[PDB]
């Protein structure tokens, strides 16, 4: 905004985004799906839910 050899001035426009939490979860586990093997009319099959 101003520039002299002994004096300056500046302006900055900052925008912020604040997330507001509804709930926070701390003690968490990932799932892993191993399923089961089945043998049927000669064919080996992997089964999963």
């Amino acid at each position: 905004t101003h520039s002299s050899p002994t004096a300056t001035a500046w302006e900055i426009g900052l925008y912020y985004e604040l997330v507001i939490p509804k709930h926070i979860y701390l003690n968490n586990w990932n799932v892993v799906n191993i399923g089961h093997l089945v043998k049927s009319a000669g064919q080996l099959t992997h089964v999963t839910i």
Partner: peptide
């Protein structure tokens, strides 16, 4: 149309000695 197999993840049921 015959009834097929049942699974239940129980290891103890499938033990072989």
């Amino acid at each position: 149309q015959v009834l097929g197999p049942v699974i239940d993840w129980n290891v103890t049921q499938r033990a072989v000695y």
